[PDB]
Structure formats: structure tokens, C-alpha cells
């Protein structure tokens, strides 16, 4: 369930879930590696307008090629069962348009 | 300012019970002289 | 077990409210302000009847109508083929066939005649109608009438009694009978008839579809120790077969206030919000000394006045056309004998005072004396004389009840 | 065929999301972000078993109490009556029967038991506990234990082991045998029981309903080729009978990550928005020659800092407390041998710069050198120095890397 | 009894209307104006039939195309082979196969047969034609013409009888016949073929499918006693087989207003909510003195124009072109003879004032000598003269009648 | 009858939109565009078949790989033991075992096979791969290959025959045939296998979970009087056991337009909203005689730049790099043959003029004389010479065709 304040424009939430999950904190704008936070094209997403409702709920799905789903994955220095099977993938949060965010 | 308008309405459980003599009425369609 | 609804939004138009035009054959939902909060309904009883409102009920309910006189003596209008009594016919009956009561700068009031009365209600209507004649007789007089109903007619330039038995009639004898009815026809060239009085929405009244006629066959015949004159009271009904059509803008208005704004220049009475008023001060004006009327104790609110028409002279003050309030207020002026006592006087006249693009009034006293103050007011300031020089306009000595509602003016 | 549809709007009330409280015996609608837009839930195998999230399941598990020695050599401590163990009957353990971590400047690490942790998880509890004591003896250690269940005591003030045996209690052998269990049972003047430790909201810990006590009946006996010591090690487990009321704020976190900002005036890491944080330039400030924390490439973005409590000194300069960065910058000074050598410094120390109601934060290297410069600017921005003089403030070369996240800082 | 209701919302998506594209084969929810709030439609009777809305039953409907004379006297036209008649075959028909009425600066009127105007409103369309040719000939006449249906060809480029013959033809014989119908099939490469003319979205017309040729066989043959010309009369009706596809931007217009705005560069009628206009005074221009088109009796409220065209020269001048009003208006002028006598004249035409970013409109009375004092005042502007030396502009005497809707211009 | 609906409001959850990834088993409401508002589907015939997009049937179809000469008479390379030719083993091809068209400043171009193009539109896969190899040779070649399947291996680094005859292999004889299929197995540690290529999200390219490698076993032999050389052509397809898993970002893209923007510094085509652009004349611009690059006729609409990044020479000027238009426009400068003769360019060079916050461009034709211009122009907005002083900058001499969308430039 995500809540969204100060704007009254479109939002969108896409979900990649063979991404990698080598982070164990949320990353934003400028200082987010490139080649990340790029919509995507054929990947599970949820455009809603601010005006009609500004919080969104969807549910993220378990796609990983694996027996289980690791929890509490370490941080820093890897395998291929922290990169893979531990997240369920990465979740991409961005603004319908390039117009610049309000001053508060 | 505000501006506030209220309508209403008759209900159901309403009844007009006993029929009187009609008061003499006046014509809408006279207001101008 | 917490599972998941993935089932498709639905579609939805959004509305304020339900419908206002919807009376019957459905539901209309609302927050019922009761402890119970199911259907409800008024208990009731047989000391509390069912609704009597029966549209063929009440329009089957005589009313009267303007009577005349019916002389013996009269050798001139007492002959054979003299037309008495005659008007259009129609739901609503003629204005000039109804009682009336006139009064001056007011309504004229119509004692209409239930199916008048409901037939105000709807734009269209049909069906016979019930006209009982009651005559005020004995035994003694004697006399036949042919009462007629000329269809596509509505009035009596080309009617006569030889031109009216032509038509669908009926001959009452006066022989020993105080009462009888004839029932008139429907006869139109269409199924439903628009009523002849509407709602104010064009400069013309429709026209009705007949025209009923009485004449004199055997001339009325009294004798030496018997009343000449025989008043005779019409009286109206609908038939079993009359019927009203839509509901439209009642062509009627209830007698309980006959006021009425006509198109005389009445001065607009402020503004909606800018009321009710009082007489009080105000900081911008003369140092708050003089007088001017409020609608708040907080500053800078000052009554403004509506739209004055542009037809309205420059030179004019105003007059109370309506309720007014008392208020308590000025020394002699120099060269006349202009000076006001001070006591409780009852507003009635005042002058208006432009500000930019918001006017605001000035009171005066209903007096003889303070129509010339106000009078020379207002020309003062129709010559742009300074504003130190206007300034001997009432003084403000304290605050002043407010009005009802609000108060009407006139030049 | 376009039929209309006059059928009553419904009043209906506008939520913005599904109830935040509800986990269970209920549905909760939402946008599955799958190509299946139907009820769809992961697929299963033996490989994969259910849920293993039953509550008596978890708390049915041994965790381990804070161990202690019980000597026989003692002449003192090991005689008839004396106290060995005790401690409160609750859930959760006392912090003091816990195994601990202690960590300068951070937080103390619990090693709780299953039944402890659920239970910080719930407001209220309920059941029987079962203690389980193992002993490290062999064949020849001999001894007889008496360990009662007190209602209503939460100390030993004044217990003693002639008053122990007058409430629940049981009397353990150690003749041959190493492992036993005290099923405690739930004597309370309520049904449920409020957790001892809870969630930071007042001030004060509750308290629990009784009082666990082991005494000595016959001292422990061993020999001269046998170890005089046995210790003991105390463990919990929740009866068959254990219940845990409703959820609550945890009483327990992660100790993933121990470090913490408590009342200990840091001094506020900037605002949430101005991060991350880099050194950069300013065309306001001394035409960006100097360095100062920015937030954005874009002009007119400098790192503002938060709520500056009003308890600090003027005169005072900052720290880093957590994580830093690494930046490149200042020549001699007169009448001082006060130079920075051209050179990659990790930033340490700082100086607020005030510019209206915004604050601001000027970069000082890790430096005994620069712990003495951010020192002398502190003052002279204390005293209103003048603008020009206090600029010989390090100076700005290049941009430097941009920081994790938040920067904390000290007095 | 209140009980709790914690059913789980739905999610629901809000929009402002029901569907703007169905028309058949629904329900369309609406607020009925009516006092019973059911379904209601309107009653019936053998008086009023069903509705008359049945495709094939309109399209069957015989239409009159282009006659032509049949002269059996001429010696070159009447041989074996000339082409007597053809054009394009489709459901509407060729413009100049149409009777046409044509109107100076206005729209060409044409009489479309039931077929070509239903066509108009459909995109696509197939099915066979029918052709009915109508002879006004006596029994004396004689002949036999060859009608042929050429499938892929529009023109008659390579167009002969002896090629005629070729293709899906008819052969018709004039003895003691006056009427007969040639059915034409739908041969095409597809299934559906779209119209030949459309709604104004690109610049080229489509093409019809095929074409039909009327040839001669055996020359009209008449005699000295009868009539050497004999009129033919096409008809066309849709076939039983013949359907209307989809939908589309009707390709015709009512001939109820043959009034247009064609690429020819009209002045624009203001902007649309500055209308209606009436001839006014506005205090910033020349201390209302001057005749200016307002929009409204409140101050600053002149009307504004809409976007001019940057192709307009700047000297230049407009003129009435659509309906005007008429409005009363200046002394003689130095040096010339120009001299407005005070009276009402029509308004014609008129000189653009700007003012900022918004242009205002001076009314001219439409006279020879309006029309050069308002082509000086246009040449005056264009040369930045002095506001005071232009003043000598009609008069303001009083305000005028109010336009009934927008006043078109021209340059 | 309009009885009172007093039931409770329903909770409700508006969202603007149904679900966006939902994409079979579900409904999805929508406002058909159709005459028709029911359920409605395209008609269909045997003409029309139905959908054929069944995975299956699309990746069992053949794709062909990179192929390689396979030569008898190389005395080295035809050995026993030798490796001819491997590769990873994963639904996509090895970029280098594809055939490839690569174009300057443009994307490779990979004909890649119907496993390929469809498992990079999904982010798993698994199953059994069939390579088809196909020899072009004649009844005299005579050989034996060895061809393994290597699990948990992705390069021949330790690759060797004696090693490949370990692990699942097969051997063909080349003895009077031209086609054989090797069915790989699906051996992983896991169930389903990540795509080794995939949308831009990280700098690694994931692994292939086996390798496939052909060895020679008797090495090819022809003869005098046949073709030494006998290409070989590897063709890959889906087994029937081949699955693909879940929907990701495609790995792949269209190759109708092989254009593309890399981190090389474009100059970023104004901003979105401000094109299409056209050459016009600004009044603030040295009184409209220059000559900028506007997106609207309408005053204080100069194109504006996008953001210019700060790695950018100040003294450099742009070139088109996509798409340009034509323009008219300069008269000889003093001391230098820098001199423009009236006529049409086509658009190539530029300068950035900065006005505040804004960033707008300045048009120089493509020609030697014109760069040399709009260099010296660089260099003097770099030395802030006076506006005056740069003016003799193209003259304007009328507006110029827009463009068909966004103009890229480069340093």
C-alpha cells in the first residue's frame, strides 16, 4: 500500500522481479545507479491519478526460479541465492510527468 | 460569501386530511401592472 | 486466510443528488432523521383519515361565481333573444367572472373555484365541466332559458339566440325550479387543451376551445307582490370525465402576502447578505460622527446597495417602501431653520453615497424636515460638492435595532 | 432498443484504501501485478511445506536463562535453606536472567527464548510456564532441591525457603539424574496478564503476577575425584495451557542494526528531502570558493539542517556520528602556522552557517588541524565577526562523492 | 440492534458519463424530467405509427437523376455506337449526374436520391443498384440501347460499345415501352466499399467500384407527326441486397442554411461569449465621445476581437457581412466636405483599435462616405497619427439595439 | 408511492483505472467505440483463422545460426580431436553465433531464431533445446563428429574431447547424410533458468547453465574429384518440453529504426512542447532581424533548449544530428571575406544564447563559411563581448517550414 502528498499528478508503480536485489535500502532520483529507475516496458505495472485516489494497494507476486525465497539476506559481499532468491525483485515508484515537483 | 438553498419535498407517511374551501388566489400572470 | 479480490472495478457515475422531478412509482433515498433507521412511516389511525387527494374529488367541489341580477321590470333587457350571461369555457374561469377584491399598489385577489384552482396546477386539461345555476325565485316567477355551448367561439360579436341554437343546448324552465345543471361538452379539434392563465413566460394568454351562452326565451315574468329581481348565482364543477395533464408553473399564488415587487423602480433593498441592517458608524466617514447603515459591528462593514438601474435620476433621494426601523439622531445650519431635535424618529427617507464601485445609503428621519435634508442631499452630491461642506447629513449619537429582513427603497 | 435506466442512485460512502488492521477471516481487494487477473496464489510441493506459524508450536521450544555455578565446597552458600535461583513468573524473561551483549554507545542484545519473543509481540499472556533445569553432574553428585511457585511476590524481600514450601512447590532429586522440568501454573486474580516490558509509552514496566524460587533442602554433595562445581542451566518453554491475548507495539527490535539516536543531542542530520549530501560551491558564498554541503547540482540548493535544539552552545562546533565522505580542499593563515595541505580528507567536524531561517553546514576534514579551525569559526560567528574576515573556511576545489544517506552530527 | 458491517470495500472506477458511441442494444441510465420516475415512453395508438426507420425500406425509394434529350433528328449523335449516357457506379451518385442549384458566394445545393443520402451516413457499403430509366415516348418510337456494368473502370477513356459487349450488360428495346429497370450486381475485389465522397479529412475522393454505360444499338427512329426528341429520365433505388456498413462524418449538410465561412478571410465576428454587441461609449476613449461596440452596459467591457489573420494589411479596412443593427450618429471636418448628418443608418463598416494584446471594433455607418472615412481612419492608424488627430470618428448620441447573435467581417 | 431507501451506505474504493498487467482470465471494462454496446467480436470465417500465437508452436519453428567452412584438406585443423565449433547453451543465441549487420554510429542487427526473439520476453525459461545440423556435402564425405552437452560449463577453456565423452554426448556419422538433430537435455540445478540477456537494469549479463561443443572423431575425408570444403549450418528449435516463465522488459527491440541516443553527448532537442521549430524573428533580439529558432507565431515563443550538460565546452558550438530543415538568410563583416549570399540552406550548425533561466538557439547554415561563423560566435558569447558587437549572427529574412518533430545537435 503506497502513499503518495504532495502531488496531484499521476503516478506510476512497476515491479521487476528477476531484477537483482543487492540493496537493503531504498535509493532516490539523481543518486540512483543509472540504467535503474527506467520505466520499463513489458513489466507488471499500476498507473493511478492523484486526483482520484492518492494511495495505491497492489500486490507483488513471487516469481522466482527457485524452491524457496530466502529471507534475511546479507548485505555487502556475495551469491547467486542473495541476488536471486532472496527479494522478490525491485519495486520502480515514478511521476507521470517531467514537471517539476512542487516546492514543498 | 456562502450561499445556501434549500428544497423540499412531501414524504410517504404524509397525508392531506381534511378538504377546506380554496383561499381567493392570485394570478402570476399579472405582476407587471 | 486473508484472500485476495481480483475482481474487476466497475464503472460508476457520479451524482449529487437523486432525482427532483420524480414524485411517484419509485424510491427515493435519503438519511431519515430518526432513532429507527429502517422504513418508517407516521402511525396512524381512523381519527386520522387516508390523504384526501383525489384529483376528481376535489374538482368535483362547486365554486361560485360573479352573480348578476335578473329584473322583470326592465322593459328593455327583459325580451325575448337578450343575451344575459355569458364567458369562455375553460378549467380556469374568466378573471372578470370570478369575485374579486382589488386594492390599491397591491394584487387583485381571485376567489377561484376548485377545479380553477388545481387546473393552475397543470399546463394541459380535458373533459366536460359542471355549470349549476342557482336561482333565487319562488313559486311565483316564471321563465325558459337556452342556455348554449358554441364550440370555437370565445366571444359574442357574431352571437345571437338564433345563431346559438345551432348548437349543442339545453332549455331550462323556470316553472316552480330553483337549481339545475347543464353539463358542457368537450368538443375540440384536439385531445388535450392548454390552460388560458400560465406562468410568466410570454406576453400572451392562450385562448379557451368554446363559449357558453345564456339568452331569454319567454321573458322573466314577477307580479305586483313578488320580487322583481331574481339574483342568479352560477356555480362550476368538472365532470366525471375531466382530467388534468403535466404539471407546470402554478398560475396561481397564495393571497396570504399580496405584496409585490411590479416594475416600478423600487432601490433594490442592498444586496443579499448585506442584511439585516442598522444605523451606525463608520471611521472613513466624518470621523465615525454621522450616520450610515451597518450589517456588522465589525469595521469596514457597510450595507451595499444592489444594482440601482441607470434610469434613475441623479438629483433623487430615496423612500421606505417597506418595513423600516427607528433610530435616535443634527444642530441648525447656517442660514436656515434646519435643525432636528434629538429623539427616537422611524427611518424614511435616505440618500445614497458612492464609494468607488460599492454605494451605501444614508438614513434620514420620516419627517416633513428631513425629506428636505435628504432633498438637497442629494443634490449636493450630484454637483460634486466638497465633502467638508455636505457635512451639515443626521449625527450619529448611538447604535439602532436591526431590521427583519431586509428594507426596500424608492426614488 | 436503448431502454432507460431511472432506477434510484445508492448512497455510497468514498474510502481511500481497505481496512490497515484486518490479517485475517476476511477479504482484501487489490491490483495484482500478475498477467493471471484471478484469485492466484504460488504454487506448492513437499518440497515446500505449509506455514510453520502455529503459536504453540513456536513457544513449545526451549530457550535458554543466564546459567549460574553451584559449588559444593562452598562452606557459606551450599546450606540448608539458602537461595540459589530465583526470579519473576512471566512470559517474557527479567533482562537480568538473559544472556547479554553489552556495546559502548549502543544498544544492549537480549538472547531471548521462543515464548519471550511471541509474547512481546501480544499486550496480554496466560498459561503455565515450564522451566526445564539442567544439571552438569555425574553419578556421584547428590542433592535435593526445593523450587516453589509464589503468587502475588515479585521479590525476594522476604522470601525464605520455611515460607516457600507453604505455596506450590516441588522437590527435586539429584541422585542419578540431570534433566527435570517445574510446570509453573497461572495463579492470577485476572483471566489474561499484561506483558512486563512493553512499548515506549510510559514510563514505568509492569509488573509480573508471581515469583519462581529454588532453595536448598540438602546441600550438594560431591568428592574429592569429582568436579565440587555443577552449574545449572535454567530453560523456558510455554505449557500446553499458554495463550497470548492481543497485538500490540513490539517490546523487542532487530538487532541487525544496533546503533541508535537517543536522548543525546545529535545534531539532526539536516532535513528529510536535502539528502544525500555533498560539498560544493555557492555563488552567495564568497562567489563559490569555499565549501559548503549541497543537495543539488541546481543553483539555490544548499543542504539545509532541521530543528537546531535550543540548549546547544553558540560557540559550539559538530562531529560526524555515522557515516561520512570523502572530500579535497586551504592556505596559511597570518599570524598563525594554520595550513591545509592540498589532499582527499574525510569529513569530521563542521560549522552552521545562518542565513535567515534556513541553516546551513560548512565541511571540516578529520584533522586535529581542522578541529581547531572549525573551533575558531564557531567563535567568530558567535561574536558576528565580519563576513571578510572570517573567510580565511577551507576552500572549494572539486565536488565530492555523494553520501549514502543522512549525515548525523554532535556537539 | 446496530450491527457492525465490515464487508471489504470494492474498488470502483468513477466517470462522468455513460457511453456517447451506443445506440442500440443497451440500457442508458439518465435522469427522466418527469414526475413518474419509471420506465416511461410515450403512448401509442394506430393514429401514430411505429417509427419508419427501416434501412432497406428508405434506400428502396426511387431518386431522380440528371434527365438528357434524345434527339432522333440528329444526324451525328443518333448512329449505331455513340454514348448517349454513363457515370461511376455507387451508392451516392456523381455531382453532376445530381440537379444541382447553384447560389453566388454560397453552398451548391443538390437533390440526392434515398440511397445516395442514407449512403452519406455510412463509411462503407455493397449490394446491387437499381437502375430505372423512364422514356417519355409515344408508341411510334423506336429503338434499342445497350446498357452495360464494367467492373474496375470510373471514366469512359477506352470506353465503346464494341467493348461494352464484353462485360454484364443488358439490351433494352423502345417499342411501346416507356419504363424498365437495369439492376447493376456489386462485382468488387473486396466485400464492403467505401464512399466515394466523405467528411473533410483529406483532399482526395475515393472511387467508385465500377461504372455504367447506356450505347446505342438501333437508332431512335420517330416520324414527321411526332416528337423528334424523347427526354430520358435515370432513376436510382437500392437493391434487396444492398447494406450500409459503418457510421461516419455525414458527407451531406441541410440545405436549411446554405451559409458558409469558406477559406476566404472573413474578420472574425469578435470572440465567443463578446457577443451579442450593441454600439456603446467607453470613458478611456476620448471621454465617451466616440461610438465604440461594447458587449456589456458594466464598464470595461468592449468587445474584444478574435484572432486576425497576419496575411491582413494593416491599412486596410472591414465590412458587414453577415446580419448588422443599426445605430445613430459628425460635424464637418477641416479642409474636406465630410459631414455626417445626424440620423440611424445601417452598419457596415469599420476600423480595428488596439489596444494591447486585445482589438477593439469602430462602427461605420454603411455609406459612400462611411466607407472613405473609415478607409482614412484605417490609413491613419497605419502611420501611428497622433490619438487626438483621429478623433476627427462617429460620434456617441446613445446606445443601440443589440445584435441577435455574432457580426461577420471582411477586409 | 416514493417510499424512503434508508440503507446503509456501502464503503467504497475509487481508483482511477483498471488493472494495467492483467492480461487474460479476467474482464476488462472499457467504453467500446461502437454502435453497439454489448459484447461485441470481430466476425470471422475460415478466411480469417484464428489467433496462432501458441508459444509452442512458435519456438519449435527452425532459426539458423552463425555457419563455419569445415575443410579436409586443412592439414592443422582436420585432426582427430579438434574443436569445430561451441557454444552456451540457452533458449537466446550467443550474440557472436548469430548472424550480424552492424552499421557506423548505429545498433547491431541480430537475426535472431523463434526460441530466441520469444524467450526475451520472458525472464525464465527451461526445457530441452534441438540443434539441427544441416551439411553441405554429397554421398563421397565421409566423417564422424562427437558433439556433448557440458552441464555447468560456459567456455572451452578446459574443454577437450577426452573430457566431452563424460557428459551426455552423441555421435553422427557423416556417411550419405545431410541433416541430424541433437536434442540437448535440460540439467540445472534449478527448476526454471534466467535469460542471459535482458533489459537495462545492471552491467552483467547473466550465464548460461551448459555448453555444447562438436569435436572431430574421424576427420572429414573428400576427395580429387569433390569439393574439399562442406559448410555446416547450426539451426536451433524449441524441444516439446520448452517453457518460458514470467513477462519481463524484452532484451530485444525493433530493428525497424536502428537510430539511437548513447552517452554521447547529444544536445538534447530543445525540450518537449517547445517543437516542432521553425527560423523567426524575436523584437527582443536585436529588433526581430536576426534570426532564432521559435515554436509558435505567437509573441514570447522562442524555442527553448533542454539540459545542457555541464561537461560542455563553453567556446563550442552544435551540429544537426538528426533530422533539419531549410531556411533563407548575412552581409560581408568588416576585415574579414566572412560574407552570406541570399539564398536557401539547409540547417546544420548552431549557437546557444542564453537569456536567464532559458536557453534558446540561433540557426547557421551547412556550409565551410557557416561553421567558421557560428564558431567565432561561440567564442564571443564566451568572452561576454557586448550584445552590440556580436550582432554582425544570420539576418532574418522570413519564416521557414516547420519540422516534422524534435532537431538533435552535438558539440
Known sequence: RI??????????????????SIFSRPIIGRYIAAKDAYRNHAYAAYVQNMSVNRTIEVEVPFYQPGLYGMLNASDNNTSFDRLRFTGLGDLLIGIEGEQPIPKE | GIEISVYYSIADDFSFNIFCGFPPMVYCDETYS | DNPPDPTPAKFFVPIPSHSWAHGTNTSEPTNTLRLDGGVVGVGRSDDIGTSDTAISGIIGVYGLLKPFDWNANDTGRNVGGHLLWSMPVHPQV???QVIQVMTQSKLTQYYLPPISVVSSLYAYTRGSIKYKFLFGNNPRHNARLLVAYIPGISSDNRLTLERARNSAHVVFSLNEVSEFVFTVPYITDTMWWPRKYGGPQ????????SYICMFILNPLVAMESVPSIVTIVPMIAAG???????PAQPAVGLSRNIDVIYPKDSIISFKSGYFPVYVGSWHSFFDSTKAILR?????????????????????????????????????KINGTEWFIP???????????????????????????LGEKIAQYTASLLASNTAISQIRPIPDYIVDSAASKDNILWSP
Open chain 3, 342 to 368: 434629538e429623539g427616537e424618529y422611524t427611518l424614511g427617507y435616505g440618500v445614497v453615497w458612492r464609494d468607488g464601485a460599492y454605494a451605501y445609503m444614508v438614513p434620514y428621519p420620516l419627517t416633513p
Open chain 3, 94 to 96: 374568466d378573471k372578470d
Open chain 3, 295 to 331: 450589517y456588522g459591528a465589525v469595521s469596514d462593514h457597510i450595507a451595499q446597495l444592489g444594482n440601482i438601474p441607470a434610469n434613475v435620476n441623479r438629483k433623487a433621494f430615496w423612500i421606505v417602501v417597506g418595513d423600516t426601523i427607528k433610530f435616535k439622531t443634527l444642530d
Open chain 1, 3 to 20: 502513499v503518495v502528498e504532495g502531488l496531484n499528478s499521476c503516478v506510476w508503480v512497476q515491479h521487476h522481479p528477476d531484477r537483482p
Open chain 3, 202 to 209: 410570454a406576453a400572451g394568454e392562450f385562448v379557451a376551445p
Open chain 3, 240 to 246: 366525471d370525465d375531466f382530467e388534468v395533464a403535466v
